[PDB]
């Protein structure tokens, strides 16, 4: 980019003679209301922005100020990585070569290490009458332990 930039002030000035300066903060994982001023980046340090919030937004004047720092020799990036477990039928997997899909018809009743659509563990697989929802590939018990597949 042209230069690193970030918001230094994002406050709501309320009413009267703008004598109350309430700062508007963000919640974890969320965007700022002052990002709409210079979404592509602040041109210069200390730029001043104003906006008139409507009744659907709390009212008052939204003053935003941004700061600009010069670009480095090498672009430096920041990452925030989050993962989830057990919230999907499929999964995201890295390029790990587990081998090839195998069959359980020769191993019924024998404890076998398994990795089924990202869900891994050890257990004994027994042919059963279908219970639970078909599209929901996994049937879990009352303690979030797999009991069907």
């Amino acid at each position, epitope marked *: 980019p042209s230069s690193y930039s970030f918001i230094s002030k994002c406050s709501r*000035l309320t009413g009267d003679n703008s004598h109350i300066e309430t700062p508007i903060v963000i919640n974890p994982g969320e965007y700022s209301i002052c990002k709409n001023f210079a979404p592509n980046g602040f041109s210069q340090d200390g730029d001043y*922005f104003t906006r008139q919030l409507s009744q659907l937004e709390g009212g008052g004047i939204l003053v935003g100020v941004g700061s600009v720092t010069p670009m480095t020799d090498t672009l430096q990036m920041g990452f925030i990585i989050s993962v989830q477990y057990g919230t999907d039928t499929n999964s995201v997997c890295p390029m790990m070569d587990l081998g090839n899909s195998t069959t359980i018809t020769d191993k019924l009743g024998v404890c076998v290490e398994y990795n089924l659509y990202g869900v891994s563990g050890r257990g004994v697989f027994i042919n059963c009458t279908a219970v639970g929802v078909k599209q929901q590939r996994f049937v879990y018990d009352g303690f979030d332990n797999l009991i069907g597949y």
Partner: antibody
Amino acid sequence: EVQLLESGPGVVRPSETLSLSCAVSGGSISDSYRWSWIRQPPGKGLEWVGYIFATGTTTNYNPSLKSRVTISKDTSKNQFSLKLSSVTAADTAVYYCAREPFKYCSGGVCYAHKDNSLDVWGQGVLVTVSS
Amino acid sequence: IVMTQSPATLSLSPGERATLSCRASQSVSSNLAWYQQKPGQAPRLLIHSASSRATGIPDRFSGSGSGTEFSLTISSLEAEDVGVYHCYQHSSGYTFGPGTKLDIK
């Protein structure tokens, strides 16, 4: 267009405070970045006296004024005034009402740099300290 | 800082290449303006950057420069241009220049 006429006395005694009143006649106080005062002693160059933000009560002053200067705004009457305390014969000058404009006021957004060149000035009121 | 203007009293003739010059103690980030003050008049802005001409200014004006040296260049020396030319800087603090002075011959 905004025209800035200002009013006040012309003769101030030593140690007696100096009050000026500059009223804006185009738009309003809240249609600008900040409003500033500029003085100029007779034949001695201009000088920056201070400024007041249009939104908020934040103000800045010349450090060479020893915190003797208070510049306030009153949106009700559409004016912003100046008070300089402990006036001296060395302080006699002509005081210029000024304005620092936004670069654009589009939609509902006004964008101005942190420091901009004064754009529209008043005529100026000539004060003197004497007896 | 301490600004300066070199040509002091640069009297001129109708039709020239009038070139002013305003130097700063330290570099300014192009935050230099030019103001023109007739005898007994509020100062009137001319340029609000290195060469960003302001509204209503005749095209004959074109300043130049950045950092520590600047200039204001006028060719058509018209009688409605005789006066005083300050230079203003807002990069550090807010200060005005010494002030030049021009006249016809």
